[PDB]
Every structure is written in C-alpha cells, then in structure tokens.
Amino acid sequence: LQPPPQQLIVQNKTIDLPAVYQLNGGEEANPHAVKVLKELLSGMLISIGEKGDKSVRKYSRQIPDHKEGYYLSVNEKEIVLAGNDERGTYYALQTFAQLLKDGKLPEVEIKDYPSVRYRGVVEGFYGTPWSHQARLSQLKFYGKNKMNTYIYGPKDDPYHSAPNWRLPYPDKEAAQLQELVAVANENEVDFVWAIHPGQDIKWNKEDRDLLLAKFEKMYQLGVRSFAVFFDDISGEGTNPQKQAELLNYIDEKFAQVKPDINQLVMCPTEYNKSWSNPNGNYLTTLGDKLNPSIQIMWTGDRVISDITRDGISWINERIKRPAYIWWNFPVSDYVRDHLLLGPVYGNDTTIAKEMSGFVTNPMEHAESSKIAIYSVASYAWNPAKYDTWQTWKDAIRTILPSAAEELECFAMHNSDLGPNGHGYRREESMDIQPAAERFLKAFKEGKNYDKADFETLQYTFERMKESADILLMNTENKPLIVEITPWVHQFKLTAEMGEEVLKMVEGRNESYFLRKYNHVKALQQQMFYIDQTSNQNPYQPGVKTATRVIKPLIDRTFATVVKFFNQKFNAHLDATTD
Ligand SMILES: CCCC(=O)N[C@H]1/C(=N/OC(=O)Nc2ccccc2)O[C@H](CO)[C@@H](O)[C@@H]1O
Ligand SMILES: [Ca+2]
C-alpha cells in the first residue's frame, strides 16, 4: 500500500470481490469515488459515503476526524468505504483499488489521513515544457497517489508571466487549461494557478486590480486555488510590507469573498536560508503582516537542499507559520545531461507538523519524474512510515510492471547529479560500489584482484546490456521510453566498454589485446557522438550515465591496463578516455 495508511489491521483471511452486491450510498457519496468503485466491479453490502451520509451512519465513530481522512473495512459480510469528507472517500477508493488483486480482497481494517496538509508537484523547472498530454497523465497519477496539489506554470504559456499576465487567456488555450482543471477536479487535485508578475509590477491601484481581475477570470475558468510569485521581483517590489498588503488584499477581496477557494500561496523573495539577509527583516516582516491563511513557500537552507528539523524551525520561527516546502528534486534543469532516477531521501520524517505543504519540482522528463513523485506522495502522506528503498521499488514496479527489474537496474546507475553549481549530490551504484573499490585498489598495484569482484563487474555489465535492450523495445509506457532513450543507448555503450576493458584485463595475448583496445576507442567515440548530438541545450548539452562509480571504474581500469601494456611491450598506446 502506497502511501502506507496511518493505521492498518490485516486479518489474514481473503474474500472474493462479490459476484452480486448491494450498493448503498452511490447517490450521495463523492461522484469521483463512486466512479472509481463502479469501474472496479461488473448480495454482499458495500457502503460508500462521507461522514453525515445516511449510508455510513453505522461507522461514523470509525471515521478519522482529519481533513482527507477515511475509514475502510473489508470482511466476510461487508465492505465499508467511508471518508471524513469527499476527497477522503476518493482516497478510500485509491487504497481499495490497491487491495484488489486477481478478483480477491484481503480482510482488513484501515484508518487513514495525511500527515502533511498539501502534497504534490510544482511545474517549476527550466527546459522543454511538458506537453498537454503529459500533464493530463501527471494529474491522474497524482490522484492515484493521493497528491492533492499541482502548481501549474508551463514556460511556453505566457499568460501567467510578465507581461501577458494582465491579459486573459485566448480561447483555444483557455479550453485546454479548462481540461486540466476538470481532470484535476476528477482526481481530487487542486489545480493551483500561479501568477508570476514580479518582473513588471508596480505598487499602484491599477496593477493591483488587474491582478484581481485576472484571478476572477481564472475563477470563471474553474480555478479554485492560486499562487503569487515574488522570487523574480525587482526594486521596490522586494518590500515585504507591500507584498503582504497585496496578498492580504487578494485574500480579503477574493479568497474570502468566494465560497470555494482552497489554497492561497505565495513565493517569497527570500526563499531559502542562504539567500536571506541576516541584517535585513524580510521574513519576520512578512511573517508578522501576512494573513495567517496564506502559505509561504520555502526550499530550506539552500536552493537545493533536503529539509531538516533545524532548517524548518529556523524558518517557522520567522514567518510565524509552518513553511510550505518546495523541494528541488528530481529537477535536473541544472544538470541537464543527467537523469535523476534514484530514491527520494534526506528529508526529515518527524517534522510533519512543522510543514503546511510539500511539493516536488520535477524534471523536464515528465514520465521519468514519476519515480520521485510517487515517493514524495508516499513521504508526505505518512513520513513516519516512509521507506526510501521500498518506495523506490514500488514506484518502479508501478510505472513499468512489464520490465521492473530492467528499470531498477537502469535507475540504480542513473541517480547522481555529477559535480555541479549547487554542490548537490545523490548516491549511485551502491550495490556494486564495494566490488568496484576493491578491484580498483588491488589491480592498480599489480596485486591480484579478487576473482569474485571481477565476476561481479562482468555480471553487472551483462545485466546492464540486457536491461538496456529490453527497455528500448518496451511498449507498456512509450512516453517513458522516448524520454530515456538517449541515456539508455549511452548506458548500453557504457556496459560494452566495461566488458571490453575487462577482456583487456584478462589479456590473453598481444594481438587480442589490441583488438579490444581498438574496440574501446571506437566505443568511446560513439559515446562522444551521442553526447554531441542528443539532448543539446545551451547549458549542459548531452547524455551522461553511470557517472559516479561505473564509468570512472572503467576509465581507470582502462588507463591502468594500457600503462602495463606500454611497459611490457615498449609501446605508446594512448591511455586517455578524454
Ligand atoms: C521557491 C523555489 C524557486 C526556485 O527553485 N527557482 C528556480 C531555481 N533557482 O535556482 C537558482 O540558483 N536560481 C538563481 C540563482 C542566482 C540568481 C537568480 C536565481 O532552481 C530550480 C533548480 O534549477 C529551478 O528549477 C527553479 O525554477
Ligand atoms: Ca456526501
């Protein structure tokens, strides 16, 4: 079960999904939840509803008193799916669908609710914006994983940024947004429309209600949640009193005047500790003057950082509310030549009460981002039960059941950022790291390497090639495969290089060695070709893979083995990989 319930009792028996059922509550439970339920089955009583519905009266003491909470029960005589509110019943069904395997249900009893109020994704990365279809797919994935939040803002959409923010959406674009909003609604996600006025806004009555008027227009289109960004604001616009006053005005005239506005969030100009002036008074001012119903976004101690108890105390003390965390992972828009497919880890698991929200900023690779996104959904719903490694594997098995082992193999070796401008790193290839390290230490001093570590490495390379070739031809998730194809090609080429280098280590004779050596040089050059021709971008063009442990192991083994050959046969073979 992902995310894992707050409370779960499994009774060790298993019942059949009823051949014949009595559906009680179908006309008064959340229609989004009923829709899912009716999809799941084509007599035994099944009761669906929210606290206060007639249909769930019997079980209202079992329904948790938390927003988005629910009670779920399965046993011999009946099935209960009962939310504390509408979204909660929908969340009951997302768990129910995960329990239902081969027409059979386990006998269980669940009491569940989220530890973090707002959970989901911010579309805030640089690079090729996601397509329309990518976003419809993301929205459905958020619903399944009980993420309640999507902060919109594609960079090819000019009507949320300076200067066309003042201007309303054109007809054809409007209807597309409208489709996003509708799909979000259906999946119980708050479509949060973010405005980015900072670049060209003035503190005067005119810009003041061009914003209001814009929000109203967005309201007519179905938008029920809103964000305002000040990260990019300049000059007098960095005044926290002026910012507070604008947002409070938006709160007073709009958020509190409308019946059904959910989220209202702002991004401050000081959005991490290291970009905060110690002598200034930006955040305390903002925290004193901003209405209490308005969230303040925060990335932690640095632009890229994992959230700690000290970090969250330091900010919460100043804005006088629990920070709304923006986590800059797996976003790779500053290491564009890397894919970040590793586990999600580093965030403190005891600090749920200290955060109002937790949203991840993903990659420009929408589908490849689902691994971290699923993990974040799991962390933010139940941090205290959060299992990094198990959640990673579940995500992979969920995203690509037909080739889960292959995707795991691939992702294990595509997780580190490599060295970069934020100094942010992730672990990679941990499984084979000790075998690598030993081999490298031993071999380098003509002191025998272990046969078992040689075999581990051989085994790895063989497995990488199989994984790579299976992944290329996989048709269960074509969008995913299209995103990762350049890296998969490069990852395969890496595996081949490693195999040929290991045949150089086992050097049989002079002729065979030179054959292997020429093949490695040719393979290097194919890697360079892909790096010069795929994923070209002004910032970090190209395709890097297996960069933490595996490629340095291969480069060094190659450099070393060529050195020994130059010594033994008086040759001058090039020993570089550069
Ligand atoms: C509240 C978060 C704001 C944020 O994260 N902004 C950008 C962001 N900014 O990072 C910077 O280093 N920005 C910056 C640095 C110097 C001067 C101005 C901005 O980091 C992310 C990762 O690359 C980008 O995807 C974001 O769009
Ligand atoms: Ca109801």
CATH number of the domain residue 525 falls in? 1.20.58.460
Exposure b/e, 4-14, CB count within 10 A at least 16 = b: bbbeeeeeeee
CA distance 152 to 361: 11
**Ligand 1 atom with minimal separation from the 125 CA:** 25
CA angle 22, 28, 29 (to 5 degrees): 80
101 is in an annotated binding site: no
* Measured distance CA(573)–CA(513) in Å, rounded: 11
Is there a contact between 102 and 17 (Cβ–Cβ < 8 Å)?
Answer: no
**Torsions phi, psi for 471 (to 5 deg):** -65, -40
Give the separation between CA 474 and CA 488, rounded to whole angstroms. 12
Tell me which method was used to determine the 3D structure: X-ray
Q: Which of 89, 113, 137 is the last residue of a domain?
A: 113
413: region left, alpha or beta (phi > 0 left; psi from -120 to 50 alpha)? alpha
231 is in an annotated binding site: yes
Cβ–ligand 1 distance for 231 under 6 Å, the answer yes
For residue 29, the ligand closest to its alpha carbon is 2
Shared-domain flag, residues 62 and 108: yes
Residue among 273, 303, 358, 417 to mutate when testing ligand 1 (max atoms within 8 A of CB)? 303
As a whole number of Å, the CA-based R_g of the chain is: 27
Cβ count within 10 A of residue 338? 25
Asked if 394 and 411 count as a contact pair (C-beta separation under 8 A), the reply is: no
Pair (132, 156) in one structural domain: yes
Q: Is 125 in the pocket of ligand 1 (CB under 6 A)?
A: yes
Is 271 assigned to a binding site?
yes
- Cβ neighbours for 474, distance < 8 A, ≥ 6 positions apart: 400, 402, 403, 406, 481
Q: Do residues 126 and 211 both lie within one domain? A: yes
> Residue 451: how many CB atoms within 10 A of its CB?
8
Does residue 24 have a known ligand-binding role? no
**Distance from C-alpha of 90 to C-alpha of 82, rounded to nearest angstrom:** 9
Which residue's CA is minimally distant from atom 25 of ligand 1?
Answer: 125
Residues 433, 519 within the same domain: yes
- Domain shared by 374 and 408, yes or no: no
Q: Which two tokens stand for residue 371?
A: 């691994």
Helix ranges (H only) for 187-226 are 205-220
Q: Can you read off the two tokens belonging to residue 283?
A: 């955040």
Same-domain status, 374 and 293 = yes
Q: How far is CA 368 from the centre of its chain?
A: 9
**Residue 221: domain span:** 114-399
Q: Do the annotations mark residue 361 as ligand-binding?
A: yes
Both 186 and 203 in one domain: the answer is: yes
Q: CA of 66: how far to CAs of 28, 63, 81, 88, 508, in Å? A: 20, 9, 16, 9, 70
Q: Identify which of 390, 322, 388 has the alpha carbon closest to the alpha carbon of residue 349.
A: 388
In this structure, the residue with its CA closest to atom 13 of ligand 1 is 303
Query: Which residues, by Cβ under 5 Å, contact ligand 2, an ion?
Result: 28, 50, 53
- Indicate whether residue 232 lines ligand 1 (CB < 6 A): no
Rounded alpha-carbon distances, angstroms, from residue 562 to 64, 169, 311, 398, 565: 67, 63, 49, 44, 5
Query: Binding residue per annotation — 328?
Result: yes
Residue 171 is a catalytic residue: no
**Phi/psi at 207 (5° precision):** -65, -35
Q: 326 CB less than 6 Å from ligand 1?
A: yes
User: Is omega for the bond preceding 538 within 30 degrees of 0, making it cis?
Assistant: no
3-state secondary structure of 77: coil
d(CA 534, CA 341): 19
Please identify which of the residues 232, 288, 306, 387 carries the catalytic annotation: 232
Whether 37 and 157 map to the same domain: the answer is no
| CA 303 / ligand 1 centre spacing (Å) | 6
Say whether both 367 and 417 belong to one domain.
no
Which of 377, 399, 421 terminates a domain? The answer is: 399
* Whether residue 334 has its Cβ less than 6 Å from ligand 1: yes
Q: Is position 326 annotated in a ligand binding site?
A: yes
Inter-residue contact 225 to 262 (CB < 8 Å): yes
CATH classification at residue 264: 3.20.20.80
126 C-beta closer than 6 A to ligand 1 = yes
- What DSSP string describes 21-37? EEEESTTTS-HHHHHHH
The CA distance from 59 to 53, in Å, is 10
The number of angstroms, rounded, from the C-alpha of 391 to the middle of its chain's C-alpha atoms is 12
- With CA atoms as reference, report the closest residue to 355 among 61, 109, 118, 121: 118
* Cα 310 to Cα 301: distance, rounded to the nearest angstrom: 9
**Domain shared by 455 and 562, yes or no:** yes
Closest ligand relative to 357 C-alpha? 1
Q: Say which ligand is closest to the CA of 26.
A: 2
Same domain, 100 and 170: no
Contact, 84 vs 113, CB < 8 A? yes
Final residue in a domain of this structure, among 366, 399, 432: 399
Where are the extended beta strands (E) located within 17-152?
A: 21-24, 44-50, 70-74, 78-83, 104-112, 118-122, 149-151
Residue 131 phi/psi, 5-degree rounding, is: -80, 165
- Ligand 1 neighbourhood includes 328 CB (under 6 angstroms): yes
Give the number of other Cβ atoms within 10 Å of residue 492's Cβ.
21
Find the ligand nearest to 54 CA: 2
**Would you say 311 and 273 are in contact if contact means Cβ atoms under 8 Å apart?**
yes
- Which of the 8 DSSP states describes residue 326? E
Q: For residues 56 and 247, give the distance between their C-alpha atoms in angstroms, rounded to a whole number.
A: 40
The data reach a resolution, in angstroms, of 2.3
In this structure, the strands spanning 225-229 and 264-267 are parallel
Write phi, then psi, for 361 (nearest 5 degrees): -95, 110
**Which DSSP helix (H) or strand (E) runs through 228?**
strand 225-229
Distance (angstroms) between ligand 2 centre and the Cα of 84 equals 10
Distance 328 CA to ligand 1 centre (A): 9
* 340 plus 422 within the same structural domain: no
Total domain count, the chain: 3
| Residue of 328, 332, 333, 359 with the most ligand 1 atoms within 8 Å of its CB, for mutation | 328
- The CATH number of whichever domain residue 7 belongs to comes to 3.30.379.10
CA-nearest residue, atom 18 of ligand 1: 232
Q: Give 20 Cα–ligand 2 centroid separation in angstroms.
A: 24
Q: How far apart are CA 198 and CA 192, in angstroms?
A: 18
Containing 387, the helix (H) or strand (E) segment is none
Question: What is the C-alpha to C-alpha distance for residues 100 and 98, in angstroms, rounded to an integer?
Answer: 6
Ligand 1 pocket check for 191: Cβ under 6 Å? no
Query: Is ligand 1 within 6 A of the CB of residue 303?
Result: yes
Tell me, in angstroms, the distance from the centre of ligand 2 to residue 491's CA. Answer: 52
CA distances from 246 to 201, 212, 241, 301 (A): 11, 10, 9, 27
